[PDB]
Amino acid sequence: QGTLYIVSAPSGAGKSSLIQALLKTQPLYDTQVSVSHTTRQPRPGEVHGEHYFFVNHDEFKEMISRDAFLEHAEVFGNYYGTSREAIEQVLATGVDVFLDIDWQGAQQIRQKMPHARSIFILPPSKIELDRRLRGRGQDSEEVIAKRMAQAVAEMSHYAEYDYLIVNDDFDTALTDLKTIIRAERLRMSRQKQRHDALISKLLA
Amino acid sequence: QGTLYIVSAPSGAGKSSLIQALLKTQPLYDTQVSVSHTTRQPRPGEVHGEHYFFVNHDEFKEMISRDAFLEHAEVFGNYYGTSREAIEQVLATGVDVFLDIDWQGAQQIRQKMPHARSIFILPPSKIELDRRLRGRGQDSEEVIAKRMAQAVAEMSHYAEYDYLIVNDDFDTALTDLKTIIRAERLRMSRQKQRHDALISKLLAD
Numbered sequence: 001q002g003t004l005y006i007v008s009a010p011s012g013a014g015k016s017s018l019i020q021a022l023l024k025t026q027p028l029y030d031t032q033v034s035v036s037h038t039t040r041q042p043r044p045g046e047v048h049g050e051h052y053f054f055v056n057h058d059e060f061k062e063m064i065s066r067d068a069f070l071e072h073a074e075v076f077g078n079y080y081g082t083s084r085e086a087i088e089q090v091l092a093t094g095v096d097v098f099l100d101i102d103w104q105g106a107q108q109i110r111q112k113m114p115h116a117r118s119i120f121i122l123p124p125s126k127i128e129l130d131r132r133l134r135g136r137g138q139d140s141e142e143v144i145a146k147r148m149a150q151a152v153a154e155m156s157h158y159a160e161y162d163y164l165i166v167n168d169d170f171d172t173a174l175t176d177l178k179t180i181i182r183a184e185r186l187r188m189s190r191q192k193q194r195h196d197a198l199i200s201k202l203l204a
Numbered sequence: 205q206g207t208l209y210i211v212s213a214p215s216g217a218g219k220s221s222l223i224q225a226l227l228k229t230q231p232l233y234d235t236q237v238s239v240s241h242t243t244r245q246p247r248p249g250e251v252h253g254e255h256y257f258f259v260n261h262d263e264f265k266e267m268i269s270r271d272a273f274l275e276h277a278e279v280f281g282n283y284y285g286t287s288r289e290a291i292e293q294v295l296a297t298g299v300d301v302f303l304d305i306d307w308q309g310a311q312q313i314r315q316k317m318p319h320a321r322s323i324f325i326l327p328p329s330k331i332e333l334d335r336r337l338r339g340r341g342q343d344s345e346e347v348i349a350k351r352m353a354q355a356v357a358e359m360s361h362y363a364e365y366d367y368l369i370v371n372d373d374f375d376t377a378l379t380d381l382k383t384i385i386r387a388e389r390l391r392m393s394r395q396k397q398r399h400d401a402l403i404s405k406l407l408a409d
Contacts, residue, residue, distance in 0.1 A: 120392075122399075122402075122403070122406065123406070124402070125402065125405070125406075126405050126406055126408070126409075129406065148409075152406070152407055152409070155403075155406055155407060156407055158392075158396075158403065159392060159396055161392055162391065162392060163387075163390045163391055163392060163395070164390065164391075164392055164395035164396065164399070165390060166395075166399060166402065176386070176390060179383050179386045179387050179390065180387050180390055182380075182383045182387070183367075183383050183384050183386075183387030183388070184387070186367045186368060186369060186380055186383065186384055187366065187367055188324075188362075188363060188365055188366055188367060188368055191367070191368035191370075192362075192363055192368065195326075195368065195370060198326075198328070198329065198370065199326070199359075199362065201329065201330050202326065202327065202329075202330055202333060202356075202359055203356055203359055203360055204330075
């Protein structure tokens, strides 16, 4: 019923913000963000099943052994992963899910979910990507150069995705994202289900 | 480069006006309607290459022999069809082409143009379809029942299409159409070509 949207981009393409901006304007019965499993400890305020599903390292490795993840990775001595079951339960409710992930996990997901759509977001020029990576302007030139090399390595994978948004002006990019989602919702397999009663009435 | 959009709908779904409104706000280097070939005789105002590509029965038949049409029909002594050459020429210049056609012509085109996208447009309810078919309201219940039967026959094929727009509010339907065309242009196949130079500068150094 719902569509899984894999969203990736180098730092500096405004990806995280674009997704957050999307959730602020769509009801949870239409659009939700993926909730990942993690082995890190819950922090104050976090809720299991809401900010993350919190498991311990053995549970996570056990899950991995039963191939329970669409993707997982170890990051700073903690594992993070996207549970297949969790994603399917939400999609089965007709909700579209946005799964922000690097190109590696995006490749893992696509292998298990051929129907997942994926969107890559790019910065609009080398100069603007460099400006956005510099943020407040407080990092050393070498740290920035490593951020740029990392962004370039991420962007080299752009052709593996189904859609490309060049985020120059934020609101233009965000309209682009909403356009993708709206168009996918005008597709016949979703529309004939959504308008099932109406079509039956029109043809009777 | 460009995409062929097959657009169909029963009368009463605002299809022609939606397409027309589309052409009013997009440049010819982005969007055009297809120009059909026909043996009918040019009429007042019609210009070859614009309202139709006018040709005579022998040319049309020779084209049919060459399977040069994506679809064609023969009605009241005349041929009407969409030249495959004329469409691919425009598509090859990166332009999206809209082809307004009935469901039968739509099936003919799809088989020959698997990459074409089709959009079907529906009225928003039986009562509103009936209201729109009655128009100014100067027709017999017989003519209306016939319009409605014809609309029903057209709608029974809606599932053969890639997209469905339910045209309740006109402006909202027009935005739907524009959304489809913009989303298609965001696909990787077209974006990677459109931004080739940008992408190459981003990866450089």
